[PDB]
């Protein structure tokens, strides 16, 4: 049985812990509880393949910075998360991307870009803006809603389908 390591990375409050818990415990966390570090793992069958994915939920607060290296080393795939009503979280995806390919020392690491909270009316970041960025990185982009559960599976599954092809 295959074991895929996934690391969820992004600015604070963008919806990493919420997206994760929705895939696993299947239900929307309505509260904000600053994550330090939590790891989940579930029995899943993706494309007929039965795998056990180990998901590392990162801290978005810069106050829990340091930890970044250690966990970015031992992780196969990375899904970068930004909230569509948080312009800074978008602009922040760039520095995350670099820190990933910097510690890994590789110009190509499995990586999906997620646009979360797309269930909200507020929207300071257009989908093209993301499309353009994901494109120049050579990676896929998915818009999700931990609340409405939109694209949540699409995001994580595409990330494993990504690791395999690489």
């Amino acid at each position: 049985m295959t074991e895929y390591k996934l690391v969820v990375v992004g600015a604070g409050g963008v919806g990493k812990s919420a997206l994760t818990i929705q895939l696993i415990q299947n239900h929307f966390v309505d509260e904000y509880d600053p994550t330090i570090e939590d790891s989940y793992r579930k029995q899943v069958v993706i494309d007929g393949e039965t795998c056990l994915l180990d998901i590392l939920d990162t801290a978005g607060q810069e106050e829990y910075s340091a930890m970044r290296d250690q966990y970015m080393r031992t992780g196969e795939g990375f899904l970068c998360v930004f909230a569509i009503n948080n312009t800074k979280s978008f602009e922040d995806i760039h520095q995350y991307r670099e820190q990933i390919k910097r510690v890994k020392d590789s110009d190509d690491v499995p990586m999906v870009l997620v646009g979360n909270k797309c269930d909200l009316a507020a929207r300071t970041v257009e989908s093209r803006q993301a499309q353009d960025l994901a494109r120049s990185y050579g990676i896929p982009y998915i818009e999700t809603s931990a609340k409405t559960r939109q694209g949540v599976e699409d995001a994580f599954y595409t990330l494993v389908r990504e690791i395999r092809q690489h």
Partner: protein, 82 residues
């Protein structure tokens, strides 16, 4: 000051404590989805025995007070050594 608890098989959760064992265990059990800090006890895999910590780590195992033997993935998670 910032503890890492192992439980529900592989799963781990991190929390910040100020010394109060009971309060911290409570928060920890919340992060794992388990009720009441009486049903549980903390144990740390040490060399060749599941020692039960009385009063204080990158590894602490929440295990049921009744039958305190951590799962194989729980014990396996302790592979993390520095």
């Amino acid at each position: 000051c910032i503890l890492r608890f192992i439980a529900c098989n592989g799963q781990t959760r991190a929390v910040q404590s100020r010394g109060d064992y009971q309060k911290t265990l409570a928060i920890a059990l919340k992060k794992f989805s388990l009720e009441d800090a009486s049903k549980f006890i903390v144990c740390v895999s040490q060399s060749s025995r599941i020692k039960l910590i009385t009063e204080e780590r990158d590894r602490l195992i929440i295990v049921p007070k009744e039958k305190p033997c951590p799962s194989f993935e729980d014990l396996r998670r302790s592979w993390e050594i520095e």
